[PDB]
Amino acid sequence: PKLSQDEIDDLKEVFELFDFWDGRDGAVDAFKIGDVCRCLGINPRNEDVFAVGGTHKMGEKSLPFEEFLPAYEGLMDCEQGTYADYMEAFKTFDREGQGFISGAELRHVLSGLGERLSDEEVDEIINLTDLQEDLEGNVKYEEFVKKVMTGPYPD
C-alpha cells in the first residue's frame, strides 16, 4: 500500500505496453486493468477488478495512467490464495483421499465452479503445465497446484 519507485516504474512499462495494444494514446481499456496487474504480479479476481473500474466488456471505458495507478492500489491488497488454501479445497473432492481427482472433476472445478474459466483457458493451462492425465484419467491435484503457483518461468 505504498509502491516503491521501483514498483511504480514497473507499473509503467506494463501499462505503457498494454496501451500499445488498444492503440497508443496513453489509455488502457478498463477491461485489461485486470490483465495488467497479472503482468505486474498480482492475481486479483474478477470481483476484485469489477470493483475498481473494471468493465465487463472491452471498449466500454478507457483508463489513463493517472486513473489507473489508483486502481492498482485496491488490487495489491486483494486476498491472494495459498498452497494450503488451495490444496485443502482441492482436497474436498479427493474422496479416494490419495491426492487424486477425476480428470473431468478437475475440469468441472476450474470451469464449472466459482468464477468459471473458459474451456480454452482450462486447456491452455492444462497444456502449459503438462498435467499429463495418467492411466485411468487421474492427476495429482497437488503437483498441478504447485506448478500454476510457481508461474510459467520455473525456479
Binding site: 476484485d48 479445497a89 474436498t92 476450474l110 468464477e115 468459471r116 474459466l117 493451462i125
Partner: protein, 798 residues
Amino acid sequence: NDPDFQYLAVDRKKMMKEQTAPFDGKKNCWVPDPKEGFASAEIQSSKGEEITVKIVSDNSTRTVKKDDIQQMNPPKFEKLEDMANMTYLNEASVLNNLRGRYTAGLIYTYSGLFCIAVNPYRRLPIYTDSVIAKYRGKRKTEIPPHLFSVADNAYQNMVTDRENQSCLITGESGAGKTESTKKVIMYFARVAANLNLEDQIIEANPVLEAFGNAKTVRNNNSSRFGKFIRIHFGPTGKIAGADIETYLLEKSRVTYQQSAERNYHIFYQICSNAIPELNEVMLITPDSGLYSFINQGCLTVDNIDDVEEFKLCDEAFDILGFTKEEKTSMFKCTASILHMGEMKFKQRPREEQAESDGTAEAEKVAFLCGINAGDLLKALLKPKVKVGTEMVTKGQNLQQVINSVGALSKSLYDRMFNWLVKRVNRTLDTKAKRNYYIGVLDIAGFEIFDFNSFEQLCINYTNERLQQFFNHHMFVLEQEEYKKEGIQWEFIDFGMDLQMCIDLIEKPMGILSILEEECMFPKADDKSFQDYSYQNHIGKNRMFTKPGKPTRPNQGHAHFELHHYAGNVPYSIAGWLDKNKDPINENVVSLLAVSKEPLVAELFRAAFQTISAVHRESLNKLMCNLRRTNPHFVRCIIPNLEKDPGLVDAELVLHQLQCNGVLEGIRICRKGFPSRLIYSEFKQRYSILAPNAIPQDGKTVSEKILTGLQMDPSEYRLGTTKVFFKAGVLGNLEEMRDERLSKIISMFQAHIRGYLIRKAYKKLQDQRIGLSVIQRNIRKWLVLRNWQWWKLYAKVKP
C-alpha cells in the same frame, strides 16, 4: 447398497446427484403454509418485524413475521437418518425430513431416542429373515432406521445388561401400531431360539378387540385400555412364554354413550344375527338401536358388518383352555348389562325414595345371574348399610341408585375383563422358567380436542406423567455421554419442568384432589367445584390459566387451560363431579358374590370412592413398574386421514409429533450441546475454514480450526473423542465452508488467469516492435507510392 436396503437408505446416487439447490443459506427458509404447514422459501427485503417473501414451487409474495420464519437445514442434512443430528432443529425441519424420507418410500427414522415410523398403506419387502439376519446383533449406528433395530437393541439390553426392558409404542390406531407390535416379537423370537408365540396371541385379539376397542368419535376402532404385553426371559435368555396386563380401561363407555359413540362392540355383535341359536337365551332382540345403553347415537359401521367375529370369537374360545361351560356364562353375562340399563322405576311424588315397574327385566338379569329377582331391589332400591353395629336401610333417592346401577353395569365388566385377562395370562402361562422380561406397553396417548373434559384431562395426566418418564431417561442417557466424553458440566434434570404440571394434578390441593373431595359432599355443583379450584389455583400458578383465544373452528368454550408439554389444553370441568363417582354398595358384592354361578362367586369374592382415585394409583402401578426397565420407544404415525399412500397432511403429523414427545425431546435437546462430531470427521469436513493454521493429529487439527476461527466458547464443548456445538452452529460452519471453497477456488482460478498471462507477456513485448515495424514501413511505402516524384523515378529507369 444391496437390493435389501433397497427400501432402507436412499442409493448414494441421489447424494452425489443433488443439484438444483446451493443453499443460499442466507435466504431459503421454511414458512408456515396453511395448506402444507411449512413450505420452502427465499427472502428479499427485511423491513422490521415484517418480511416480504416469495415461495419456491410457487412465487407467492407473502408478508410474514420475523418469528413465524423458520430456519432451513442445509442440503447436507437431508433425508438424514437420526434427526437429533440436524443443525437447525424445529418443526418444519423435522416435519420435512420425515415427509422427505416418506416421499421416497422411507418410513423409519430416529428422532434422538424415539424411533419414528409411518404406515405405508402398502405392505413392502422391508421385513425378511435376510434383513433380520443383517441387523441381528448390530448396534444402532451400524445400519439404517428400522423397528428391528429397537428390538435386538432391546434384546441386547435384557441379556447383556441384566434388568428388564420396555419398549413404549404408541400412535393413533390409524397408524397400524399393532402390526409393528407383531414384528417386535416375531423378531423377539426368530432370534431368541436361533442360537407361534407370535400367532397364538393374534386370535385372542378379536376377543379383546371386541371389548376394549370401540368406535370413539374419531376411530371406528380404538383400544380403550392399556396393555403391557410382558415377554419374560429365563436364566439364559429363554422366551418363557407370553403374559399380558390390563391398565386403566374406561368403564365409563358403559353407562354414558355420547351422541356419536355407543358402548363396546360386543353387544353389537351379540344383537347381530351371528347366531340365532344363541340370539335369544339372554332375552334380547336383533335390532342395534333400541338399547338404552346403546342407542345414544351409533349402531353398525361401514367396513365392519359386525358378524363373523361373533362366530370366530366363539372359536378363539374353545381353542385355548376353557369349555363352553364358562364360555357360556360369558355370552349371557354380557346380556345382563343390556337389560340393566333398560330397567325402570320411580320414587314417590314430592318425596325421596324409588320404586319399580321393570321387575321383569329385574327378574331377567337376576336369574341370568342366579339371584332372586326380588333379591336385587332389596339390596338395590332402598339398600342396606353396614355401620359399626347394626345395618340401617338407606332411603333411596333416584340419585344414589340410578348411578349405583351404572356402577353395576360397569363394575362387573371391569372384573369380567380383568378376569378374562388373567385367563389368557394362564393359557400362555405355559411357564418354563422366569427371571426377566421385555414388556411392550401401549396406552392411548395424549388428546387435545375441539371440546375437552374429564376423560381427556386424565389420559393426558397419564401421558403428562409418561412423557416425563422419558425426559428423565434422555437426561441420564445424556448425563453419561457427556461424562463418557470428559466434557461435562451440567443442567438440572429435564423431567422436572413437567412436575409443575403434574403436581398441579396429583398433589394434595390440586385439580384431582379437589374433585376427589367434592364427590362426597351432597351439594356438588359444577360451578361450586369450578369456584374452589380457582380460589385454589388461578391467579397464582402458571400452569393453570383461563380459556384464551379461540384457536381453530368453533371451540367448545370451557373453564380453564392446563399447561401440558403438548401445549395448553382447554378443560371444561362441566359434569365432572357427576362422571367420577365410583360408589360401593357392600351387599350387592356378597349378593353377587355367591349367587349360583361360579364366576359370579370368585370375582366379587376374592366407600363410594372415585375413578381418578383408582386411576391415580393404577397409574402408579404402571409408572413405578416402568421406573425399572431400560426404556425404548416407537412412535408410529398415520401419514394421512385417507389411507392414501404418498399423501401427507403435515398438519396431521405436527399435531401427532406434538403429542409423541418427539418435538419436546427436541426442545430438550435444543438446550444443551446436540450436534456432536468426531474430531476425525470434523477436521476433514471443516479444515477449509482455516487451512493456513494447520501444521500439516485430529483432536488437535480441530482444536485449532475452532480456535483460529474465533469459535465462541459458549457455542461448544470439546469431549475427548468428539466435539459438541450449539444447535444451529454447524449451520454457520456449513455456510462458511460454502463460500470459502467457492472463493478459494476462485482465487485458484484467478491464479491461473495470472499465469496464462505472465506467460504471453514477453511474446507480447516482442510483438509490439513488430506491429510497429509493420506499421512503420507500410506507412513509408504508402508515402513513396503516392509521391508525385516517386512517379518520375518509377517513370523512367534509362
